[PDB]
Every structure is written in structure tokens, then in C-alpha cells.
Design a protein around this ligand. Structure first.
Ligand SMILES: [Zn+2]
Length: 78
């Protein structure tokens, strides 16, 4: 298990431009201003137009790519 969601392993961070309420259990919710952890390219599930992300560092899921701005790669805390 690659622990990008917790930030224990290397991860990408993104800032939410808008609020988002998950309609599917595959999706996760967040608010404008939230920082989200994203899986590295290799662990991205390549669902067209979505990114695998975590807000709370435990629940991972899909978020709409144009609701966030990718800021950069971050070293795991381990
Ligand atoms: Zn981090």
C-alpha cells in the first residue's frame, strides 16, 4: 500500500478552487481553499477528467480535475 493519502509517502498537493459535494461513493467532498493530497502519476487511476485525492488523509476518491489547482510534488513524512 502506497501511503500518499496520509502524506507518509511522496504525494502531490492541490488547492480547491470551489466547494464539491460527492454524489457517488467513488468521489470525495471538499471546500474552496482546502489542500488535498493526490496520488503520484503512477498511482493515478486515469479516469478521464478526475484525480485520485484525499482531503482527510484516510478517505481517498475521485475529484473533478478542474475544481483544483495542482501546486507540486511533496516528500513523504516517513
Ligand atoms: Zn504533505
Amino acid at each position: 500500500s502506497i501511503n500518499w493519502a496520509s502524506g507518509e509517502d511522496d504525494h502531490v498537493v492541490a488547492r480547491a478552487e470551489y466547494d464539491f459535494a460527492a454524489v457517488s461513493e467513488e468521489e470525495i467532498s471538499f471546500r474552496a481553499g482546502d489542500m488535498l493530497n493526490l496520488a503520484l502519476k503512477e498511482q493515478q487511476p486515469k479516469v478521464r477528467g478526475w484525480l485520485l485525492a484525499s482531503l482527510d488523509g484516510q478517505t481517498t476518491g475521485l475529484i473533478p480535475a478542474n475544481y483544483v489547482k495542482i501546486l507540486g510534488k511533496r516528500k513523504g513524512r516517513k
